[PDB]
C-alpha cells in the first residue's frame, strides 16, 4: 500500500455512526472528503438521495445494496464492515450473515448474546466473514477483555475484538493492557483519544487524537509489537454537527505518528 500504515497492513476507515445525523450519501462524501478509503456502516443508518429514509441493515433490497456498492465504488471507498449490531432475534443471525456475504463486507461489528455463540461461530465459518466483538461501559458482557475472551476463547480465528479503547478507559481499564491481552484475537477497532474524566461530569468526550489521555503513540506501539493487521475505525462521538475538520486533524496525527514508529 502506498502510506507506511497501509504498507503495514493498518487502513484507517469511518465509522458512519460519527455521521448519525447525516444521510449515508453525505457520510460517504465526508468520508471522501477526509481522503478515507474504508467505512464501517451502522445499521439503521438512513440513506438519503433518491432512497430517502430506507435504512443501512440486513432487510437492505438487492437493487439498493449494488446502487450502495457503486456509489462507494466511485467515491474511491469499500464498504468493510457493518455494527454495532445487536440481534433482537436468534433467527436474525442468519439474515446478518448473508447481507454480509451479498454486500462483501470483511467483519460484523457486534455485541452477541452469551448464548449464541455456538450459531455465531458457526456463521463465521459457513459465510468466511469475521466477528468483531464490540465493548461498551456496564452494564454490558464484553466491558473487559477476559469477558470477551471467556466466551470466544478456544473458537474460530475469524472471531475477536472489535477494540473500542476508549470505553476501555472509562471502565478504569489499562487500554494498552487491554490491547495487550487481546494479542490475536483484535478483528477491528473503534480508535479514539478521550479527555480527562472531570468528576462532575458524566462523559468524557472523545478529543482529537494526540490531545487526550489514551496514549494513542503507546497504543501504536503495542499493536505494531503484535503485528496487528486491521481496520481502525474512526468513531468521533463529539461535535456531531462540525467534526469533519477535528477528524482530519485526528487523520494526520495518525499518520505522523505511524510514520515514526514504521
Same mark, same amino acid.
Given at each position: 500500500g502506498q502510506t507506511k500504515a497501509e504498507k503495514n497492513g493498518w487502513r484507517l476507515g469511518m465509522q458512519s455512526y460519527s455521521f448519525h445525523l447525516f444521510p449515508l450519501t453525505e457520510a460517504l462524501d465526508k468520508t471522501q472528503e477526509l481522503g478515507l478509503k474504508y467505512i464501517e456502516i451502522y445499521p439503521g443508518h438512513k440513506l438519503g438521495g433518491k432512497w430517502g429514509d430506507k435504512v443501512f441493515d440486513f432487510n437492505l433490497d438487492a437493487q439498493t445494496q449494488k446502487e450502495i456498492k457503486e456509489l462507494a465504488a466511485s467515491k474511491? @471507498?469499500? @464498504?468493510v464492515g457493518t455494527g454495532v449490531y445487536v440481534a433482537? =432475534? %436468534? %433467527?436474525?443471525w442468519e439474515k446478518m450473515f448473508k447481507f454480509a456475504k451479498a454486500m462483501d463486507l470483511e467483519f460484523i461489528t457486534c455485541e452477541p448474546a452469551l448464548s449464541d455463540w455456538d450459531l455465531v461461530e458457526k456463521l463465521s465459518k459457513q459465510y468466511n466473514i469475521k466477528i468483531s466483538v464490540h465493548n461498551h461501559p456496564?452494564? /454490558?458482557?464484553? #466491558? =473487559?477483555?477476559e469477558n470477551l475472551l471467556k466466551a470466544i /476463547?478456544?473458537? %474460530?480465528?475469524s472471531l475477536g475484538s472489535c477494540s473500542d479503547v476508549g470505553h476501555w478507559r472509562r471502565e478504569g481499564l489499562n487500554q494498552i493492557d487491554c490491547l495487550k491481552q487481546l494479542k490475536g484475537r483484535i478483528i477491528s477497532l473503534h480508535f479514539k483519544d478521550i479527555a480527562p474524566k472531570k468528576a462532575g461530569e458524566n462523559e468524557q468526550h472523545d478529543v482529537i487524537w494526540g490531545t487526550g489521555i489514551l496514549d494513542v503513540k503507546g497504543m501504536l506501539k503495542e499493536l505494531k509489537s503484535q503485528n496487528f493487521k486491521g481496520v481502525f475505525s474512526i468513531e468521533y462521538e463529539y461535535? #456531531?454537527?462540525? %467534526?469533519v475538520p477535528d477528524i482530519k486533524e485526528c487523520i494526520q496525527y495518525f499518520n505522523k505518528t505511524a510514520n515514526e514508529i514504521l
Open positions: 474511491g @471507498i469499500k @464498504i433482537e =432475534k %436468534s %433467527s436474525d456496564q452494564p /454490558s458482557d464484553y #466491558w =473487559k477483555p /476463547s478456544g473458537r %474460530s480465528q461535535n #456531531w454537527e462540525n %467534526s
